[PDB]
């Protein structure tokens, strides 16, 4: 799809996140997804024109914006299968942008 | 040198015509851009996104589950004179700072 880059939310079992934890506890996971065509820049035009002509000393360059978090949630706490209290830092996104 | 350079600011002298902005100009600018490698597994958020995707929970949306080497700031303006002696000011043409986002 091509909905614009933004914050999305999904209710997930923490065992689905693959953190190494067995947990059937549900957490609200927030993430960044979507299209960045409206976010086109003159920088990206020039960079694409230079990569094509082999002017960038064979380095990997990103000439298109990426939809990514600009900020993260500080803490997500949950209990595991042994009822042990756990905290995870910067699990969910708090804000998104086409970078 | 042999090996992938880490994400950072790079500079290159270019004629404005080379940038393909729509105007021919032989004026040389120092173009600055972001290039290089980012460690793909530096984030618990990216690990979560990766596992959700492999288990087919995020279908149909464009999702970036690794950091991108991109500008975090741009140089304000770049001005130049074209072949018709017409003045142009281009905003945010060159990067000022880079990061793995």
Q: Are A85 and A77 in contact (CB under 8 A)?
A: yes
Residue B4's domain comprises: 1-101
What is the experimental resolution, given in Å to one decimal place? 1.6
Task: Check which CATH number belongs to the domain holding B28 and give it.
Answer: 2.10.90.10
Integer CA distances (angstroms), A27 to A30, A77, A91, in order: 9, 9, 10
Q: Are A29 and A12 in contact (CB under 8 A)?
A: yes
Structure token digits, residue A13:
């079992």
- Considering only CA atoms, which of B43, B42, B32 is closest in space to residue B70? B32
Question: How many pairs of residues across A and B have Cβ atoms under 8 Å apart?
Answer: 133
d(CA A27, CA B76): 42
Residue A74, beta-bridge partner list: none
Contacts of B56 (CB under 8 A, 6+ apart): none
Method by which this entry was solved:
X-ray
Euclidean distance between the first and the last CA atom of chain B, given in angstroms as a whole number: 25
Candidates B35, B45, B71; nearest CB to A59: B35
d(CA A69, CA A71): 5
- Considering only CA atoms, which of B54, B16, B92, B70 is closest in space to residue A67? B70
A interface test, pick of B14, B25, B44 with most A CB neighbours within 10 Å: B44
For chain B, the domain total comes to 1
């Amino acid at each position: 799809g091509a909905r614009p880059c933004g914050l999305r939310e999904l209710e997930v079992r923490v065992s689905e996140l693959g953190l190494g934890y067995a947990s059937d506890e549900t957490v609200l996971f927030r993430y960044c997804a979507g299209a960045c065509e409206a976010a086109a820049r003159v920088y990206d035009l020039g960079l694409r024109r230079l990569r094509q002509r082999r002017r960038l000393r064979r380095e990997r360059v990103r000439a298109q914006p990426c939809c990514r978090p600009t900020a993260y949630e500080d803490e997500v706490s949950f209990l595991d299968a042994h009822s042990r209290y756990h905290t995870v830092h910067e699990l969910s996104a708090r804000e998104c942008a086409c970078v």
